[PDB]
Amino acid sequence: MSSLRHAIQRRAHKERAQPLERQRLGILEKKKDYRLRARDYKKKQAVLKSLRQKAAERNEDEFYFGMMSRKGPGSALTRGKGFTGTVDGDRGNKALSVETVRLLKTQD
Amino acid sequence: GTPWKIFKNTAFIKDMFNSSLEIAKFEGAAIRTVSGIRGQIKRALSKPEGYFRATFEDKILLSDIVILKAWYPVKPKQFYNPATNLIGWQSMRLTGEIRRAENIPTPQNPNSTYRKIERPERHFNPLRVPKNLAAELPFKSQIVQT
Amino acid sequence: IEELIKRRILAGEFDEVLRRRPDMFGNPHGVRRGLVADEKLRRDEEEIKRMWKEISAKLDALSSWHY
Amino acid sequence: GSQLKRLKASLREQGLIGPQKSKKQKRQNANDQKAEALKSIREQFNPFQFKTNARGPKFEVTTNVIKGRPELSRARSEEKRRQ
Amino acid sequence: MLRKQARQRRDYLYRRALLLRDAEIAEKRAKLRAALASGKPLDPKIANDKELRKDFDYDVSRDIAKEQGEIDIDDEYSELSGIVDPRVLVTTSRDPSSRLMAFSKEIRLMFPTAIRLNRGNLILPDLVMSAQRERLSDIILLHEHRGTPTAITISHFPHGPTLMASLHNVVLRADIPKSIKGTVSESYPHLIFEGFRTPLGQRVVKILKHLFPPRDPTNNAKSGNRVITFVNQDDCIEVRHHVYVRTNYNSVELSEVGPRFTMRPFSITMGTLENKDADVEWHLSQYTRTGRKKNYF
Amino acid sequence: SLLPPDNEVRRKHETLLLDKLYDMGILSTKAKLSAVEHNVTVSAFARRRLPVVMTRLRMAETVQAATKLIEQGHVRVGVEEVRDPAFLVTRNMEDFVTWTVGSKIKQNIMKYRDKLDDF
RNA sequence: CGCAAGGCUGAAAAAUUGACGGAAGGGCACCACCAGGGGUGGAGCCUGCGCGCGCGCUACACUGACAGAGCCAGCGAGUACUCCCUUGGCCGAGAGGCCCGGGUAAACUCUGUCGUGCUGAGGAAUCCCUAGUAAGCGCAAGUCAUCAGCUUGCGUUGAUUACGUCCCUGCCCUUUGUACACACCGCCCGUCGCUACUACCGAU
């Protein structure tokens, strides 16, 4: 039980460390650090697998209306060197008419 | 040992064996990391004499240490004093008395003494989707990165 | 393994999947295509056969003859 | 020739597979070997019992084919490893 | 067409999940049918589940037909089981060596409806595309180590399972001299299997024996002169290719003609060769505490 | 269901009914006469109609948008255009319901993916 | 708990449907012909299999060397990856860290300088190959089995010659069935088994 063990039974076991001749390589990965790595990598692989399923089961003839009001990813050929598969997002700046620029420049 | 080159799963291990003879004796062996990853010594390597190939569960890190837990047989020594106390007898001294007698310090390893580890809060890199996949997936799940 | 082969070949039991006739469903006896109470139950079976002819006609016409 | 056809030809020459002879034919035979023949036939028609080279010898020299039994060698080495 | 194959794969997986749910139900319906014809009392939940009573009165007949074996299970092979002749091609890896090419020719001779295709520069999606385009039943890869094969990947089509197996103790056809061997007899072979009892073993037996053409059943027990054997011990399925002649009523003479393998399966994926992300069905569980004590198949 | 369970014509017509309904995509399975008893549904037929099946195939955003489109005559199935929004697409035609040849919708999709081939 | 669980004993058939063929006629096959190509087999390295054998790898010159100029890929992103081991020296009571020494392509194209010079492309045999195939070329990854002496991907350059024929070598199948019109074809052959009946021979 829990009252059938001594305090020396309950005494914690110390955690060893990286040897000093090898401290430059980083921290020594024990079980808890390993579980952190396994959760992170399994989560990223799960999301990448779901994206691969989506890209496979893509219908090639879909039509929303964001396709009328956005700038699609294109290809490496069309987008040139600055080509990430993501669609460019609106930074919020826009084209300003001449009258408003006159007003702003008068204030400046 | 210590990892030498680390692929996704398989890893070459250097400072554990001295020759392909010893490795071919220990072929098919159940090697184990400190992190808890099991693994298997599979085949000797050739060009550096003594290195080998191990197949692990998941990717081991260059900071890891690979251990192999074997069981070596030990036999006691066959000493026997009789303690003929009325006649006289030689009493073997102990370890601490031997050391205090002939002035040798007790051996210690600075690798072995317990110290405190400093663990920084492990943060990971974000997801990094490849370009062709991020270009090819449909409109409902296209990533938007300004 | 050689003995098991000899046993199988002598008391022949091969696990080969055998060629079934393609129309065992609609033609159970496999007749040749050339020159050639229980009354209540048979009446009920005739009724269901008529019902199925009618509903299959309706279902094909609703599917616009893609079936 | 194929394996099946060569085996059938060898057995018909050995008289183990031939047509069902009459009593007169049995009398003729009893009026007028096969063990060693059959052992040669099984040895030659189960050729994966022993490792063989297909090219033959590299340079033909004449003076006066199996090249090792891997199953028999493995059984013998395993018995030695036992003992 | 590729839209159609994707649609059928999705519908088959959805019907699989539906069969899972309905089998969890029909475990409980069968106790009702057995208690009816017997009279042994049954569980009160079974007796007072009213929806089960209505659905049971509707669907008695399928359970009885399954008991009599008249109907088949929803499977990737029961559609085209023994109606067509399942043709199959064998290829090598990217850069084949000469002994691997000869070995692929040997097993292309082993399957009587097989063709062999050179890889050359043939991207693996284009391979799967071409197979689904020419209605092939199955595809086979081979991986050499150095002139000696080490892996097969039996992949069924259009969306069936794959079996990835490692080979050992292989001896090729092309080492014995032509004076002793010869052209192998291409006839529709019989198949004998030994040691498979588990559902996994039955799955492997099905996806292995659906690579061979179906035999005419009128005199199959007596005619035919070539047999192929698959026996397993400790889930390493060992296969030989014999050709035999029946010298008597009570004795037969053998003659080993094909290669010998002891292939050990290390994966079965419910999903074809291109789909590395397919849901696995069984893989060689090593590096566990008892993965070497447990015996599958 | 009302026939006795051991009757050959009952079994043959059960398998026929289930196969016909599953090929016409009303049902989801082909093993339950109970699913025919309380799953065949005018809602199932309605979702097998054209605008909702192209909604599931993501031709359009909503069912109203799909109905407006195929009333404008943008959507063929096979090779013939369809102007009636009541056409019932079966499970073999769901793989073939596409846009029409010179559609402004097809041009807009191509312009989104930046692969607009003006030839 | 009971049955199973008492040794004329001492290792190496069925057949009215069966056994084996023959002749003719078809079909198929880079395990066949035909035309070409390419390996291995020559020298060295080594995994493997049983000193030998193959499989790969490297080297062997006109298809040259050197120097310039220009121009092309695809798959690849786990807070993760490093090839050593040491001479010295800094800061280190001690364990170490520093500093210095030693051991996104190949290709291709164009333009010039020079000129065959141990600076020699593989016998008998045997195996394979018919369109993005052979072959040349590099880049990536290392995925629970196999694989670093390597394995699998991926892109690039991309031909010659058949694509007919059963003549040779083989393999399969017809001579029974499985469908009806026109139209044609017209009793394939041998040696025995088994069965019914008939009489015969000689012992008891």
UniProtKB/TrEMBL annotation, chain B:
It is found in: Nucleus, Nucleolus. This is Bms1-type G domain-containing protein. Belongs to the TRAFAC class translation factor GTPase superfamily. Bms1-like GTPase family. BMS1 subfamily. It comes from Chaetomium thermophilum (strain DSM 1495 / CBS 144.50 / IMI 039719). The chain holds residues 922 to 1067 of 1163 of the full protein.
UniProtKB/TrEMBL annotation, chain C:
This is Putative U3 small nucleolar ribonucleoprotein protein. Belongs to the MPP10 family. It is found in: Nucleus, Nucleolus.
UniProtKB/TrEMBL annotation, chain E:
PROSITE patterns: BRIX (PS50833). GO terms for molecular function: rRNA primary transcript binding; snoRNA binding. Signal peptide: none annotated. The keyword Isomerase does not apply. SUPFAM superfamilies: Class II aaRS ABD-related. InterPro entries: Brix (IPR007109), IMP4/RPF1 (IPR044281). The keyword Hydrolase does not apply. Pfam families: Brix. GO terms for cellular component: Mpp10 complex; nucleoplasm; small-subunit processome. It comes from the Eukaryota. Keywords: Ribonucleoprotein. GO terms for biological process: ribosomal small subunit biogenesis; rRNA processing. Residues 86-274 form the Brix domain. PANTHER family: U3 SMALL NUCLEOLAR RIBONUCLEOPROTEIN PROTEIN IMP4 (PTHR22734:SF2). This is U3 small nucleolar ribonucleoprotein protein IMP4. It comes from Chaetomium thermophilum (strain DSM 1495 / CBS 144.50 / IMI 039719) (Thermochaetoides thermophila). The lineage of its organism: Eukaryota, Fungi, Dikarya, Ascomycota, Pezizomycotina.
From TrEMBL, chain F:
This is U3 small nucleolar ribonucleoprotein protein IMP3. It is found in: Nucleus, Nucleolus. One of its GO terms (cellular component) is Mpp10 complex. GO terms for molecular function: rRNA binding; snoRNA binding. The chain holds residues 62 to 180 of 183 of the full protein. The keyword rRNA-binding applies. Residues 48-106 form the RNA-binding S4 domain. Keywords: Nucleus, Ribonucleoprotein, Ribosome biogenesis, RNA-binding, rRNA-binding. One of its GO terms (biological process) is ribosomal small subunit biogenesis. Belongs to the universal ribosomal protein uS4 family. It comes from the Eukaryota.
